[PDB]
């Protein structure tokens, strides 16, 4: 399970989809609702 | 070119104000007149309904997720979310 931006307020760190790199098994980038990737 | 565009571009400023005062206002009375009164999760109406269909009647049936979707898209676009919204959209997390 964990990514939030100051916890417990405003802070909702919902994605419409991911995506990663074939690269590296952890490198991704999460589509935020927010709009900034 | 100024003088027209910019006018419009004011209107369109203007009805997404508009709009957004509808909702909120809307949220707040609808909170206020009818779900603030001890909302439960009564059980299935089956005598009501003489088809075997029980109504689980539920004031919280459709407004758990409507609220958690509405704090959501005024906390993303920016706005604040007045208190009686937060309250009780914390203890819809708790009947969720």
């Known amino acids: ?37 | 070119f100024h003088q027209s565009a910019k006018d419009l571009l004011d209107q369109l400023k203007l009805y997404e104000q508009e709009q957004f005062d509808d909702w909120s206002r809307d949220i707040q009375s609808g909170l206020s007149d009818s779900r603030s009164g001890l909302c439960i999760e009564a059980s299935s109406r089956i005598m009501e309904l003489d088809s075997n269909d029980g109504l689980l009647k539920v004031h919280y049936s459709d407004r758990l997720v409507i609220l958690l979707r509405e704090v959501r898209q005024l906390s993303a676009l920016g706005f604040v979310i007045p208190a009686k919204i937060q309250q009780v959209a914390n203890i819809a997390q708790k009947f969720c």
Request: zero cysteines.
């Open chain 1, 1 to 37: 399970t964990k990514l939030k931006k100051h916890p417990r307020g405003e802070t909702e760190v919902g994605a419409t989809a991911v995506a990663f790199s074939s690269f590296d098994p952890r490198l991704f980038i999460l589509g935020t609702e927010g709009g900034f990737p």
